[PDB]
Amino acid sequence: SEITLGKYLFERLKQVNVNTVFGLPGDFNLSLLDKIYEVEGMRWAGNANELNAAYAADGYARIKGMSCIITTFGVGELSALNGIAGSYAEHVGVLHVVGVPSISSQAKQLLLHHTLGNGDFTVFHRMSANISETTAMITDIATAPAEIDRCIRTTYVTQRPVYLGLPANLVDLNVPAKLLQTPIDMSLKPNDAESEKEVIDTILALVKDAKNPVILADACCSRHDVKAETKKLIDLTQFPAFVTPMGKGSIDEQHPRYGGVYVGTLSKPEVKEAVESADLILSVGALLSDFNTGSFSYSYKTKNIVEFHSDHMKIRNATFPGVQMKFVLQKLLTNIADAAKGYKPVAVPARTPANAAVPASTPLKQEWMWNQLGNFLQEGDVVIAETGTSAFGINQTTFPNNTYGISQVLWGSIGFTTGATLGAAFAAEEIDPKKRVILFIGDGSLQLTVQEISTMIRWGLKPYLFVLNNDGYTIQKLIHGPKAQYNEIQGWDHLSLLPTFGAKDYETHRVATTGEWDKLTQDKSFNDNSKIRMIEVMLPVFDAPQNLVEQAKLTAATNAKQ
Amino acid sequence: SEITLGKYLFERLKQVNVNTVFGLPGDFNLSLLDKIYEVEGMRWAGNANELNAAYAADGYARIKGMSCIITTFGVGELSALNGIAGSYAEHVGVLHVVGVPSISSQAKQLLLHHTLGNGDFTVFHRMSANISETTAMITDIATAPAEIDRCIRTTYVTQRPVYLGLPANLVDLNVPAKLLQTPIDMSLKPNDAESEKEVIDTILALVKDAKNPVILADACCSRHDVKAETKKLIDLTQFPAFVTPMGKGSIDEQHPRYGGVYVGTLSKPEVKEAVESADLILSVGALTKNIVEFHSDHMKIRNATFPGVQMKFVLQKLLTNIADAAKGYKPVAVPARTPANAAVPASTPLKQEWMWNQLGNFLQEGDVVIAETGTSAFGINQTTFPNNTYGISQVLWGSIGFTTGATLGAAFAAEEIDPKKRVILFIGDGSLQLTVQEISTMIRWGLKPYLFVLNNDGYTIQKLIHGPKAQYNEIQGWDHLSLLPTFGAKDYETHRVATTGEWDKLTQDKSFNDNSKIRMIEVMLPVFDAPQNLVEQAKLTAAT
């Protein structure tokens, strides 16, 4: 009938489909961590640092729904903040639990370790409040379970980080276990009825009038999961459907009505024209960041833009604050086919043609590779692309249906992906051990977070780690300073990283030509996720996707502008 | 004549003896970084991540006097914060410059990369203000030079981090070059004369009356440049002189009146007794109730505080007179140095107690000795240093992984000061994992530290306290000696030592003692092995 507060936390996490917990142990969280071992089906990742753990919790949340990272007071929590901030910016539900000193220790304002030496125990909490949806610092066992519940609810429903400070003295206190028999209620507060009705009615009327509507899926389509509603929207309507870089994967790219990746002026010409000639745009989850949009270059010819958002709706210039798109989309699906009844299906832009056959010795180039990559991918894959040439190139790759893309286009923290790949791999394993996790990471980016490969090995996770060796920071060389020393890096022996971190079941490969690329990626053995692999991909220093070359110039200009 | 604001920054850093700049590039700081190459004597480290860069800036400042790290808006600065916080906590003067979006980008609230997507360009600055002595976010070219000068002065004189945000557009605007011909004032303002004189008088009188006085040197002894003064204090008075763990290195341990390391109940029995039995204590730079506290920004004598009265100047003037006041003192015996290790067979497996005692044999004057949080930080308290040894042990903040970066920053600083100075790191296997990539940057710059890695298969210091077999205290086992070539080292040595004979043979070797190349030494130790001082506090945490 009773359970410790620490175990209560993990039982609640299990109820919200969290089975792996990220972070590192320290002075104020050890008794809490003990409780993981008491909950069947819960495991502790054992991360190699707190920043990487936060990146990993983000990757896990994207795939599983939410995540939890646990750190220790001061030294642990502050190391995580860049990971937390990226989860805030990108709308990823990560619960950050911090083990803190006992309530009396704080009251005595002792000169404890891991403090600023001034007796202020609130400072780190105050720092994190800036990048959290909400926070809690537990002080009272009587309200503790409700507060844990509140934090978990908020993390899941808002898909933003939440900070939960747990004093070490409270984790071993028993609370009634019966509390766990009432689930945390994840349902959304229903919309204002009148506002929602007006929104739905006017969208149906615009649909009835439109001769060339299009659907554009963006980040919040995925992050505030309306992927199922959006797929139904595409099917019931037959409208051409496009995706943004940040939303890529949110809609199935083998659907007959999929039209390609829209990136404003940086789109493939046919895609730009197909989208911008629309007489109605159904925009699901827009997040109009510089890199997502070719520096704010959208040029819709219609004023008829319907923006669906998690917390509001916009129709043309009219804003409907608080009207949540989930309920709007669900209700629209009931009548939308009828509204679309006039519609004569418009051709979608054709897929990029396959690469022409070339001699096997042809040196690898980016444009060739991103086009060729679609041959290797399979349904169910998680495909992760690091900020750098990889993030820009992957926009050119055609995904199989049911591909989960991760590209951190807004926050853009290089090194994120090594951690995200660990998190995505734990989550993928839990869902279906057949699902592959495929990473494209730059040589520069890998250096910032390389040690998290260690944690992949420790758990026998089997991602494909494609490392793009172009001898330094190519994306930056295109922005400014093509030969500047700050854009160069120490040259690593990438293929020795796995054995250096103690891998015992692995493969390494190197590819530098089109023949080598095709032979490796077509090999049946290589296509089974039987073990962790690293593939070093040798590419020219200044070679980059064409869209990045232009993006770089636009970005340099924006920064130098007086 | 005119110079860019960016080049102005690096000219000033040069003038205040900051010659290596840490951090990583990003679009918002690239134009700034170009300016490094325009200033002879300035270099860019090219760090492998920002947290490590901040750790390195901390090591550099400890040895050189102050440091500078440059990061990019949002993603870079937030990565650095645990480093910055440790520097705030331990009073290390690190200037954190962040390249931020242009003034026009901020005004128009452009939804740019590295923002939270909400148009708020103030948030990261506000976060850093919590762990900074002062901040500046530059908005006006006209007052930008004065603000840079203010930030640099404050970093050095307060020995705390300072945050300077530089919009990308402003770094390329021109300022009057003549400004550089007037130095930044980097000196402490003189003390209030009457207050300072009261303090000096009172101290002498307490000295005269004390039967069992001691000197105790703590963190701010070395950080605020009073090592020289303290040394003279020991000589003139001949009082027993002790250091704290954070102060270790700030008193030369070969002095006849040096009595050891005061670590409370974890001190050598004689040491604990000798300090705790004092009737007067001359406490230098702290970080019976008859205590004189010397601090960088104030003095305290028993219950009386003297705000603003700075120790640097009190100590100088005291020395002019101090000899007379202590002649009634009859030199009491200081605790004896720990006996050398007895001879044992060369095959004797290594244990920490033996190792920290033996380590003194290897160390030489001028060495920088860095010890990581974990068994290493406890063990080094047991090692006797040669004269002129600089210790780094982050006892207050205690962030594992700190030392890999600190070692990089210390090695750059030590190179600039004297190429013959060696940098010696003792880091645990666990801690190395958090910051391992910074070895890459050591190799890039041909730096030659000695990297001793304590392989005891996991987090021993935690295992001793809680969960001796808990999975969270275990780590993935790395091949440590492969790290150097994995990071592209060409000129290096690797060694493994598991016995006393192997330890002696290596560390006594003439070629090994020459800092001619980067070296890694993997030290094989038992899982539950630790120094006696840590075993003791394990029993204190026990006995419940």
Ligand SMILES: Cc1ncc(C[n+]2csc(CCOP(=O)(O)OP(=O)(O)O)c2C)c(N)n1
């Ligand atoms: C944490 C962090 N620090 C710095 C940056 C700035 N930055 C953007 S791209 C980049 C280099 C990426 O290099 P690489 O991974 O080699 O990709 P490439 O373009 O060469 O494929 C850097 C340092 C960043 N985005 N995040």
Ligand SMILES: Cc1ncc(C[n+]2csc(CCOP(=O)(O)OP(=O)(O)O)c2C)c(N)n1
């Ligand atoms: C950034 C950070 N995370 C976690 C901790 C908690 N912590 C203190 S000691 C320690 C273990 C250190 O292990 P190791 O470096 O192997 O030293 P050993 O005691 O084994 O010699 C940990 C995880 C910390 N102090 N700082």
Ligand SMILES: [Mg+2]
């Ligand atoms: Mg690269």
Ligand SMILES: [Mg+2]
């Ligand atoms: Mg260890």
